[PDB]
Amino acid sequence: KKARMTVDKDYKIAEIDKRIYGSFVEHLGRAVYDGLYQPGNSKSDEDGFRKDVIELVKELNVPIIAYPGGNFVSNYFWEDGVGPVEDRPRRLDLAWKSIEPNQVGINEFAKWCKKVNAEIMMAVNLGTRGISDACNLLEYCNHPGGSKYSDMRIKHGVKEPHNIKVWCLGNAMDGPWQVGHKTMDEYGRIAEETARAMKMIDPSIELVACGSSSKDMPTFPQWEATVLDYAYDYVDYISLHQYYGNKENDTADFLAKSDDLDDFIRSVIATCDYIKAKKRSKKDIYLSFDEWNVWYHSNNEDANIMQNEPWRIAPPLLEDIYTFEDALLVGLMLITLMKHADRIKIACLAQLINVIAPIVTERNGGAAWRQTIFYPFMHASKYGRGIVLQPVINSPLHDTSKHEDVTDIESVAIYNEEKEEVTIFAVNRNIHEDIVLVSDVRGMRLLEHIVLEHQDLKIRNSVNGEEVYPKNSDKFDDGILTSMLRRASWNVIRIG
Amino acid sequence: KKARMTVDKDYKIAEIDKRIYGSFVEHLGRAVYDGLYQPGNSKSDEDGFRKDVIELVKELNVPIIAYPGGNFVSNYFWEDGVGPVEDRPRRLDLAWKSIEPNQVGINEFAKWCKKVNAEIMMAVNLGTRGISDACNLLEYCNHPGGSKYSDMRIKHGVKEPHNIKVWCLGNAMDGPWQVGHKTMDEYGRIAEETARAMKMIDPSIELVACGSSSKDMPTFPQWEATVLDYAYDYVDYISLHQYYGNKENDTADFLAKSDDLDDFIRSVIATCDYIKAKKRSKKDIYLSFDEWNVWYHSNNEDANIMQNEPWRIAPPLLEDIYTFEDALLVGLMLITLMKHADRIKIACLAQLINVIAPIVTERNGGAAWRQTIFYPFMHASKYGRGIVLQPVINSPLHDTSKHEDVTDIESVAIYNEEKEEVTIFAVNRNIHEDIVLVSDVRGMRLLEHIVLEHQDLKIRNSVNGEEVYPKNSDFDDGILTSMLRRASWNVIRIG
Amino acid sequence: KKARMTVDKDYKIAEIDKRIYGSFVEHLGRAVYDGLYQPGNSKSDEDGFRKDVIELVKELNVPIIAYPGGNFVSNYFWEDGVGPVEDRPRRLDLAWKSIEPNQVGINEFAKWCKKVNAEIMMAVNLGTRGISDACNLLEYCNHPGGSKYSDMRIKHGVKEPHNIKVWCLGNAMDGPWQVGHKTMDEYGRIAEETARAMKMIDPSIELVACGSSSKDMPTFPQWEATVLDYAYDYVDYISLHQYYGNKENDTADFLAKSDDLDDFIRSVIATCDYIKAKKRSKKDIYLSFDEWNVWYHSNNEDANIMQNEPWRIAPPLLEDIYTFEDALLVGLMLITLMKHADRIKIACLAQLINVIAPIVTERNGGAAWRQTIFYPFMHASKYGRGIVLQPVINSPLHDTSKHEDVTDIESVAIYNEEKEEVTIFAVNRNIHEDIVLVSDVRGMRLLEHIVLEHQDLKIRNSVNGEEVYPKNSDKFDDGILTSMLRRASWNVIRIG
């Protein structure tokens, strides 16, 4: 019933990189086609982009979006998606057994990102292509003009370079389901050489080396160590991928899964710091969590489409319909991410549109709507720009199914000294009993207390109405912030 | 004196896979140009195909043909051989030091394979190309339409996909004479990733991984083990290559070399079975004997065309003219292939037309004749489909200059249940004494007893006529008695 | 004061291969553009070649010229430099942060090599390209016709094949500044297979395997050993790179650095013969010393041009202006090369035009003048064709700051049996004392004593006049030569 945390400004973690509120669009399912891009639609614009989708993205204020994959990138030929659209070919997308029509390519997607106030984090193909092709694409995007590929971009209609700031050296390739699968030293060598070459063309870019496809691979985390060992002096980030599912239908354990997330982040840092000592380097590899979400609902329908109905265009893949308990675990993951904002400078919600996404448009031109997970994200990205304060918290515990000593209240404070405000993000992961959590504000005025609750953990949103939406309204005035957060709740208590 | 055999239909070995009667055409010498393809010739059809060759091929009944290499494929660019013929380039063929005009490519050779009732086994270049090129070729050949390379095929005039069923992951690259030479780990890695990507485009194909170039390579059989260890769950066959010759003209030792072939097959099976336990797999790798023949006659001649007359188009390379004793070895080799039909599911007599071949056309535009080796192959492909019963044989034994305890008789029974026939193939490789064969059929009415025999082992065939060719020869109750002339091939039948 | 040698015409070392007087033109700085190739110049022929530049090269009697790199080749795409000039693209040159216009390419540079009576020694890109592009280019240059790339050369207006005799399998790729950098095992395998395939196209070419980028790399000499261990049977040469500098400004220690050159050559020979024993081969690998010179003046300026002013065409990179002491080390190095003529069969002064060069043209279109180092190379290339005899010399030794027991008089004698003359090359690298050179010629009349001396060890040349030049100055009875050698002098004594 009683849980307590000291809040000290003078005990920071770090400042938040706005790029931790990033997302991800893969040429996958209906993310692009019958997704953000619907050229005939009445809700679309000059370029065929759905204007309603643009606004919901803008509501999320995402600064950076990873593109174009993902597994799709490992067998993608960027030239296929540029130039006169009537000459762009159709290709087999081996990853998702689909036909890519390439109507959207680099320059279309670059426009879309401007309209949503975002920047591209661009992946290159290092599965079936290599060094010279990454150099070609980089020059096309970033070099002003006067050379083969920059002039060819100008010719395609983009006079100024896109100047993409962050690039991913391929996509994770440790798995047998991935075209262009590599051993960890193979990937290490090609990542090193691509990054060396790319930095000669544009030394102001930042480079992400790929980690394991998941923490469960037998090659994690040696893969991460081997790659950094080769490429350390040319790369700035390593990537983590993590998804959670509630296929066991065990809401107790499900929301304890953010503790495995904390374990995972820590050992990736440990691996980074080990290679740092080995190189005697002053640089710190930063973490780029470029794939994270809840993902389990649409598993079976997805393996029916592949391979019973393969080589369709924009099949309805990975269409998880999210519940309210999912939006809790999403908020728990965001808290865990903010709590590690000293090393995690990029993170991408996978994915942005239609595909395990917070934004859905109905098939065949349908309307757009917000999934449950839309809201815990929109809060974090809105009230989360500031400085993380260390979490010194005493909160009761509980066992769950297959997790022990599991905290009942996870929380983090963010002090925007910039324009006086402290925001507390807190989740009661006890699904039974409410708990009252106050906060010894040792420093600094109760603003509001937005909440996200429902008695039906399995309720969903839909094009016919949101059953999960922020309601500001709840229960401090002295120096000792007193709040009680209902069981299975997500709250953003603000203080000014 | 006599040799005894029991044959009974309950004691089976395997159903012969019909693809052990396939063959092989490389862009090599006169196999294609001045061979199966002579476009302005009175004997060729519109497409340019010698019809006498087309008809000779159909007599062999070969259901699958390996194309287009062989060493040639290790530096071939398949785009050179498709589309507007006027626009195809001439390329240096480094394997055989020739010029390749590329008038025959995929769509031509596919057309020709229709007219001989045969399928293609397609090799891709993994010598100097890799994954994405194999994926383009497979898409071009097997994807229906609606994609860049499927459409490009349609646009080249083949509306329906060739739907090739078996592919070869490169060609043997373990040798210092080959372009694109690899170590065993390089090849394993490249075989694995090509196989994986190919099965995503068309999961219905079968894939062949290349063995050693020959069992005499120091890296045999570790190459086979390394490749299958990498590629096991993505490939269906491992390949074998064997050739024999008689440069030391010792006909007895020569005819004993089928014992070597058998040992080679067994060693490859054990290698497969070892890696299978390593993987804890329920799957067996199957064997593809996609290069086998007699090969030695033309060696000096080919060494003079290389290196004194390079960069010809259609030089007469590898033009072995086979003797009667070569046909005997080929017959023993087929019998051995038949005895291992439980693991060997594809085999390719190398090669089909003019190049170490059973079908010949005389240089510069006309001939078409049958070599000595033509006939034991034709018989086997004819009366060899069915189920192999194992041989329960006790036959006399002899030594030779380099072999010990060689059976004087070697044989095998094939029972086509859809014909209530049981064909027996036997070679008496006692080159001196004849032998009579007692075959306790526990069946089950004789229909014929074909034979291939000649007094001089060194006799050849020619455009002038066939000195060697099948003739007739010579069962009552539970036994059938058949005498086998010394140094002879025998096809005996039951009904 | 006294330091002597005997000169027996049959204590022989070996005959001189004239290709040890070769050189090197890279697409670097002003070597080509605004150097040997200036189209609208009054001093240029109709093909845009500077005529005075042609004359000075012909003066140095350079039989073979390495082209087009150097680091440049490791990202070069040869197709960009052939066919109609208007269809040639501009490329980023990652090695030297320049724009490469490709107005000169291979067919132009083959024409210029005719005009200077030299042959191309051709390097193929093994950095970002491999076997099949080496074959393409070899076929283009050396195949008569009737195949795709030979007919493409014909159709570009060169009917006869260039028939290039010596190819370099890439360039040094052991350095972290090099595009396409490779481990020694990666390089040895691609050199092995490229050589194998090229020898099948043209068995009469010779091939050089690349050695270490310098003797200071931690991987030297194992790099050389590994690559020779893969490719022994398909290659004829291993290459060495050497540069010296005088940033310490210790003119005594400076001129003793030719002792280090000598130790270095011996190291590479020892490595070769170790691999010979290992292969049980009858063949000796010969040495291609395809990069040597003094280089250190322009270091600071060069680092400014990149990256302060990157992506210029023909920036003034590596425009060392050499002093007289620089020319004595060049003469001491030429003497050391001659002494190892039994193994060293090719050598390239790096480089020929403007880029650390003996021939300079003033920026923006006109000059042509000879640097200090022009003359010792000019002498050695002219009188140093013959047979190297073993120098048995007793000379006083001195110490220097970093060297011990350093010879005062470095000498060697070349005997041309045709011309009945014998040429002796000698350098007094004692900068203080004067010394005499008798020379017991156990041959057996005097004919000349050409000399390079100067008061100022730092005097340079310029477009305003050659402060350093050969003077028929200086002044043999029965069969005993005797000649005096001033401090810090280069002397060429001739007997006939």
Coordinates of N, CA and C in Angstrom, one line a residue, chain A residues 196-338:
Chain A
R196 N 34.6 3.0 -42.5 CA 35.8 3.7 -42.9 C 35.6 4.5 -44.2
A197 N 35.0 3.9 -45.2 CA 34.8 4.5 -46.5 C 33.8 5.6 -46.4
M198 N 32.7 5.4 -45.6 CA 31.6 6.4 -45.6 C 32.1 7.7 -44.9
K199 N 33.0 7.5 -43.9 CA 33.5 8.7 -43.2 C 34.4 9.6 -44.0
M200 N 35.0 9.0 -45.0 CA 35.8 9.8 -45.9 C 35.0 10.7 -46.8
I201 N 33.8 10.2 -47.2 CA 32.9 11.0 -48.0 C 32.2 12.1 -47.2
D202 N 31.7 11.8 -46.0 CA 31.1 12.8 -45.1 C 31.5 12.4 -43.7
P203 N 32.5 13.1 -43.1 CA 32.9 12.8 -41.8 C 32.0 13.4 -40.7
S204 N 31.0 14.1 -41.0 CA 30.0 14.6 -40.0 C 28.9 13.6 -39.7
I205 N 28.8 12.5 -40.5 CA 27.7 11.6 -40.2 C 28.1 10.8 -38.9
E206 N 27.1 10.2 -38.3 CA 27.2 9.2 -37.3 C 26.8 7.8 -37.8
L207 N 27.5 6.8 -37.3 CA 27.3 5.4 -37.8 C 26.8 4.5 -36.7
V208 N 25.8 3.7 -36.9 CA 25.3 2.6 -36.0 C 25.8 1.3 -36.6
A209 N 26.5 0.5 -35.8 CA 26.8 -0.9 -36.0 C 25.7 -1.7 -35.5
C210 N 25.3 -2.8 -36.2 CA 24.2 -3.6 -35.8 C 24.6 -4.6 -34.7
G211 N 23.7 -4.7 -33.7 CA 23.8 -5.8 -32.7 C 23.1 -7.0 -33.1
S212 N 23.0 -8.0 -32.2 CA 22.2 -9.2 -32.4 C 20.8 -8.9 -32.8
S213 N 20.1 -9.8 -33.5 CA 18.7 -9.6 -33.8 C 17.9 -9.7 -32.5
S214 N 18.4 -10.5 -31.5 CA 17.8 -10.4 -30.1 C 18.8 -10.9 -29.1
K215 N 18.6 -10.6 -27.9 CA 19.4 -11.1 -26.7 C 19.3 -12.6 -26.6
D216 N 18.4 -13.3 -27.3 CA 18.3 -14.7 -27.2 C 19.1 -15.5 -28.2
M217 N 19.7 -14.8 -29.2 CA 20.6 -15.5 -30.1 C 21.8 -16.1 -29.3
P218 N 22.3 -17.3 -29.7 CA 23.5 -17.8 -29.0 C 24.7 -16.9 -29.2
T219 N 24.7 -16.1 -30.2 CA 25.8 -15.2 -30.5 C 25.7 -13.8 -29.8
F220 N 24.6 -13.5 -29.1 CA 24.7 -12.4 -28.2 C 25.4 -12.8 -26.9
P221 N 26.3 -11.9 -26.4 CA 26.6 -10.6 -27.0 C 28.0 -10.6 -27.6
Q222 N 28.5 -11.8 -27.9 CA 29.8 -11.8 -28.6 C 29.7 -11.1 -29.9
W223 N 28.7 -11.3 -30.7 CA 28.4 -10.5 -31.9 C 28.7 -9.0 -31.7
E224 N 28.1 -8.5 -30.6 CA 28.3 -7.0 -30.3 C 29.7 -6.7 -30.0
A225 N 30.4 -7.6 -29.3 CA 31.8 -7.3 -28.9 C 32.7 -7.5 -30.2
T226 N 32.4 -8.5 -31.0 CA 33.3 -8.7 -32.2 C 33.2 -7.5 -33.1
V227 N 32.0 -7.0 -33.4 CA 31.8 -5.9 -34.3 C 32.5 -4.7 -33.8
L228 N 32.2 -4.3 -32.6 CA 32.8 -3.1 -32.0 C 34.4 -3.2 -32.1
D229 N 34.8 -4.4 -31.8 CA 36.3 -4.7 -31.8 C 36.9 -4.3 -33.2
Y230 N 36.2 -4.7 -34.3 CA 36.7 -4.3 -35.6 C 36.4 -2.8 -35.9
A231 N 35.2 -2.3 -35.7 CA 34.8 -1.0 -36.2 C 34.8 0.1 -35.2
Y232 N 35.3 -0.1 -33.9 CA 35.2 0.8 -32.8 C 35.5 2.3 -33.2
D233 N 36.6 2.5 -34.0 CA 37.0 3.9 -34.3 C 36.1 4.5 -35.3
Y234 N 35.2 3.8 -36.0 CA 34.5 4.4 -37.1 C 33.0 4.5 -36.8
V235 N 32.5 3.9 -35.7 CA 31.1 3.8 -35.4 C 30.8 4.6 -34.1
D236 N 29.6 5.1 -33.9 CA 29.2 5.8 -32.8 C 28.2 5.1 -31.9
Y237 N 27.4 4.2 -32.5 CA 26.3 3.5 -31.8 C 26.4 2.0 -32.1
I238 N 25.8 1.2 -31.2 CA 25.5 -0.2 -31.3 C 23.9 -0.3 -31.1
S239 N 23.3 -1.2 -31.8 CA 21.9 -1.3 -31.7 C 21.4 -2.5 -30.8
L240 N 20.3 -2.3 -30.2 CA 19.6 -3.4 -29.5 C 18.2 -3.5 -30.1
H241 N 17.7 -4.8 -30.1 CA 16.4 -5.1 -30.6 C 15.7 -5.9 -29.4
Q242 N 14.4 -5.5 -29.1 CA 13.7 -6.2 -28.0 C 12.2 -6.1 -28.2
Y243 N 11.6 -7.2 -28.2 CA 10.1 -7.3 -28.3 C 9.6 -8.1 -27.2
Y244 N 8.4 -7.8 -26.6 CA 7.7 -8.6 -25.6 C 6.3 -9.0 -26.1
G245 N 5.9 -10.2 -25.7 CA 4.6 -10.7 -26.0 C 3.9 -11.3 -24.7
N246 N 2.6 -11.2 -24.8 CA 1.8 -11.9 -23.7 C 1.1 -13.1 -24.2
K247 N 1.8 -14.0 -24.9 CA 1.1 -15.2 -25.4 C 0.9 -16.2 -24.3
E248 N 1.5 -16.0 -23.1 CA 1.1 -16.9 -22.0 C -0.1 -16.4 -21.2
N249 N -0.7 -15.3 -21.6 CA -1.8 -14.6 -20.9 C -1.6 -14.7 -19.4
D250 N -0.6 -13.9 -18.9 CA -0.2 -13.9 -17.6 C 0.2 -12.4 -17.4
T251 N -0.8 -11.5 -17.2 CA -0.6 -10.1 -17.0 C 0.4 -9.8 -15.9
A252 N 0.5 -10.7 -14.9 CA 1.4 -10.5 -13.8 C 2.8 -10.4 -14.3
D253 N 3.3 -11.5 -14.9 CA 4.6 -11.6 -15.5 C 4.9 -10.7 -16.6
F254 N 3.9 -10.5 -17.5 CA 4.0 -9.6 -18.7 C 4.6 -8.3 -18.3
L255 N 4.2 -7.6 -17.2 CA 4.6 -6.3 -16.9 C 5.8 -6.2 -16.1
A256 N 6.3 -7.4 -15.6 CA 7.6 -7.6 -15.1 C 8.7 -7.7 -16.1
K257 N 8.3 -7.8 -17.4 CA 9.3 -8.0 -18.5 C 10.2 -6.8 -18.7
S258 N 9.8 -5.6 -18.3 CA 10.7 -4.5 -18.4 C 11.9 -4.6 -17.5
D259 N 12.0 -5.6 -16.6 CA 13.2 -5.8 -15.8 C 14.2 -6.6 -16.6
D260 N 13.7 -7.6 -17.4 CA 14.6 -8.2 -18.4 C 15.2 -7.1 -19.3
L261 N 14.4 -6.1 -19.7 CA 14.8 -5.0 -20.5 C 16.0 -4.3 -19.9
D262 N 15.9 -4.0 -18.6 CA 17.0 -3.4 -17.8 C 18.2 -4.2 -17.8
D263 N 18.0 -5.5 -17.5 CA 19.2 -6.4 -17.6 C 19.9 -6.4 -18.9
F264 N 19.1 -6.4 -20.0 CA 19.6 -6.4 -21.4 C 20.4 -5.2 -21.7
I265 N 19.8 -4.0 -21.4 CA 20.5 -2.7 -21.6 C 21.9 -2.7 -20.9
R266 N 21.9 -3.2 -19.7 CA 23.1 -3.2 -18.9 C 24.2 -4.0 -19.4
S267 N 23.9 -5.2 -19.9 CA 24.9 -6.1 -20.4 C 25.4 -5.6 -21.8
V268 N 24.6 -4.9 -22.5 CA 25.1 -4.3 -23.8 C 26.1 -3.2 -23.5
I269 N 25.8 -2.3 -22.5 CA 26.8 -1.3 -22.0 C 28.0 -2.0 -21.5
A270 N 27.9 -3.1 -20.7 CA 29.0 -3.8 -20.2 C 29.9 -4.3 -21.4
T271 N 29.3 -4.8 -22.4 CA 30.0 -5.3 -23.6 C 30.7 -4.1 -24.3
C272 N 30.0 -2.9 -24.4 CA 30.7 -1.7 -24.9 C 31.9 -1.3 -24.1
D273 N 31.7 -1.2 -22.8 CA 32.8 -0.8 -21.9 C 34.0 -1.8 -22.0
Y274 N 33.7 -3.1 -22.2 CA 34.8 -4.0 -22.3 C 35.6 -3.8 -23.5
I275 N 35.0 -3.5 -24.7 CA 35.7 -3.2 -25.9 C 36.5 -1.9 -25.7
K276 N 35.9 -0.9 -25.1 CA 36.5 0.4 -24.8 C 37.9 0.2 -24.1
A277 N 37.9 -0.6 -23.1 CA 39.2 -0.9 -22.4 C 40.2 -1.5 -23.3
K278 N 39.7 -2.5 -24.1 CA 40.5 -3.3 -25.0 C 41.2 -2.3 -26.0
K279 N 40.5 -1.3 -26.5 CA 41.0 -0.4 -27.4 C 41.8 0.8 -26.8
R280 N 41.7 0.9 -25.5 CA 42.3 2.1 -24.8 C 41.7 3.4 -25.3
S281 N 40.4 3.4 -25.6 CA 39.8 4.6 -26.2 C 39.1 5.5 -25.2
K282 N 39.1 6.8 -25.5 CA 38.3 7.7 -24.7 C 36.9 7.7 -25.1
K283 N 36.5 7.3 -26.3 CA 35.1 7.3 -26.8 C 34.3 6.3 -26.1
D284 N 33.0 6.7 -25.9 CA 32.0 5.8 -25.4 C 31.1 5.4 -26.6
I285 N 30.9 4.2 -26.9 CA 29.8 3.7 -27.8 C 28.5 4.1 -27.1
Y286 N 27.6 4.7 -27.8 CA 26.3 5.0 -27.3 C 25.4 3.9 -27.9
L287 N 24.2 3.7 -27.2 CA 23.3 2.7 -27.5 C 22.1 3.3 -28.3
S288 N 21.7 2.6 -29.4 CA 20.6 3.0 -30.2 C 19.6 1.9 -30.2
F289 N 18.5 2.0 -29.5 CA 17.5 1.0 -29.4 C 16.6 1.2 -30.5
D290 N 17.1 0.8 -31.7 CA 16.3 1.1 -32.9 C 15.2 0.0 -33.3
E291 N 14.9 -0.9 -32.4 CA 13.7 -1.7 -32.5 C 13.2 -2.1 -31.1
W292 N 12.1 -1.6 -30.8 CA 11.4 -2.0 -29.5 C 9.9 -1.9 -29.6
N293 N 9.2 -2.8 -29.1 CA 7.7 -2.8 -28.9 C 7.1 -4.0 -28.3
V294 N 5.8 -4.0 -28.1 CA 5.1 -5.3 -27.8 C 4.7 -5.9 -29.2
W295 N 4.8 -7.2 -29.3 CA 4.6 -7.8 -30.6 C 4.3 -9.3 -30.4
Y296 N 3.1 -9.7 -30.5 CA 2.7 -11.1 -30.4 C 1.4 -11.5 -31.0
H297 N 0.5 -10.5 -31.1 CA -0.9 -10.7 -31.4 C -1.1 -11.4 -32.8
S298 N -0.5 -10.8 -33.8 CA -0.7 -11.1 -35.2 C 0.2 -12.2 -35.7
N299 N 0.8 -13.0 -34.8 CA 1.8 -14.0 -35.3 C 1.2 -15.0 -36.3
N300 N 0.1 -15.6 -35.9 CA -0.4 -16.7 -36.7 C -0.9 -16.3 -38.0
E301 N -1.7 -15.2 -38.1 CA -2.1 -14.7 -39.4 C -1.0 -14.3 -40.3
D302 N 0.2 -13.9 -39.7 CA 1.3 -13.5 -40.5 C 2.0 -14.7 -41.2
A303 N 2.1 -15.8 -40.5 CA 2.7 -17.0 -41.1 C 1.7 -17.8 -42.0
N304 N 0.4 -17.3 -42.0 CA -0.5 -17.8 -43.0 C -0.2 -17.2 -44.4
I305 N -0.1 -15.8 -44.3 CA 0.1 -15.1 -45.6 C 1.4 -15.5 -46.2
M306 N 2.4 -15.8 -45.4 CA 3.7 -16.4 -45.8 C 3.7 -17.8 -45.2
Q307 N 3.7 -18.9 -46.0 CA 3.6 -18.7 -47.5 C 2.4 -19.5 -48.0
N308 N 1.2 -19.0 -47.8 CA 0.0 -19.4 -48.5 C -0.4 -18.4 -49.6
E309 N -0.3 -17.1 -49.3 CA -0.6 -16.0 -50.2 C 0.6 -15.1 -50.5
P310 N 1.7 -15.7 -51.0 CA 2.9 -14.9 -51.2 C 2.9 -14.0 -52.4
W311 N 3.8 -13.0 -52.5 CA 4.0 -12.2 -53.6 C 2.9 -11.2 -53.9
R312 N 2.1 -10.9 -52.8 CA 1.1 -9.9 -52.8 C 1.8 -8.5 -52.6
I313 N 1.1 -7.5 -53.0 CA 1.6 -6.1 -52.7 C 0.9 -5.6 -51.5
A314 N 1.6 -5.0 -50.5 CA 1.1 -4.6 -49.3 C 0.1 -5.6 -48.7
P315 N 0.5 -6.8 -48.4 CA -0.3 -7.7 -47.5 C -0.4 -7.1 -46.1
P316 N -1.4 -7.6 -45.3 CA -1.7 -7.0 -44.0 C -0.8 -7.7 -42.9
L317 N 0.5 -7.5 -43.0 CA 1.4 -8.1 -42.1 C 1.6 -7.4 -40.8
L318 N 1.9 -8.1 -39.7 CA 2.2 -7.6 -38.4 C 1.2 -6.7 -37.8
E319 N -0.1 -6.9 -38.1 CA -1.1 -6.0 -37.6 C -1.6 -6.4 -36.2
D320 N -0.7 -6.2 -35.2 CA -1.2 -6.4 -33.8 C -2.2 -5.3 -33.5
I321 N -3.3 -5.8 -32.9 CA -4.3 -4.9 -32.3 C -4.0 -4.9 -30.8
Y322 N -3.6 -3.7 -30.3 CA -3.0 -3.6 -29.0 C -4.1 -3.4 -27.9
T323 N -3.9 -4.0 -26.7 CA -4.8 -3.9 -25.6 C -4.3 -2.8 -24.6
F324 N -5.0 -2.6 -23.5 CA -4.6 -1.6 -22.5 C -3.4 -2.1 -21.7
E325 N -3.3 -3.4 -21.4 CA -2.1 -4.0 -20.7 C -0.9 -3.8 -21.5
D326 N -1.0 -3.9 -22.9 CA 0.1 -3.7 -23.8 C 0.7 -2.2 -23.6
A327 N -0.3 -1.3 -23.5 CA 0.2 0.1 -23.4 C 0.8 0.4 -22.0
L328 N 0.5 -0.5 -21.0 CA 1.3 -0.4 -19.8 C 2.7 -0.9 -19.9
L329 N 2.9 -2.0 -20.5 CA 4.3 -2.5 -20.8 C 5.0 -1.6 -21.7
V330 N 4.3 -0.9 -22.6 CA 5.0 0.1 -23.4 C 5.5 1.2 -22.6
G331 N 4.7 1.7 -21.7 CA 5.1 2.8 -20.8 C 6.2 2.4 -19.9
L332 N 6.1 1.1 -19.4 CA 7.2 0.6 -18.6 C 8.5 0.5 -19.4
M333 N 8.5 0.3 -20.7 CA 9.7 0.2 -21.5 C 10.3 1.6 -21.6
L334 N 9.4 2.6 -21.9 CA 9.8 4.0 -22.0 C 10.5 4.5 -20.7
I335 N 9.9 4.1 -19.6 CA 10.5 4.5 -18.3 C 11.9 3.9 -18.2
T336 N 12.0 2.5 -18.4 CA 13.3 1.9 -18.4 C 14.3 2.5 -19.4
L337 N 13.8 3.1 -20.5 CA 14.7 3.7 -21.5 C 15.2 5.1 -20.9
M338 N 14.3 5.9 -20.4 CA 14.7 7.2 -19.8 C 15.7 7.0 -18.7

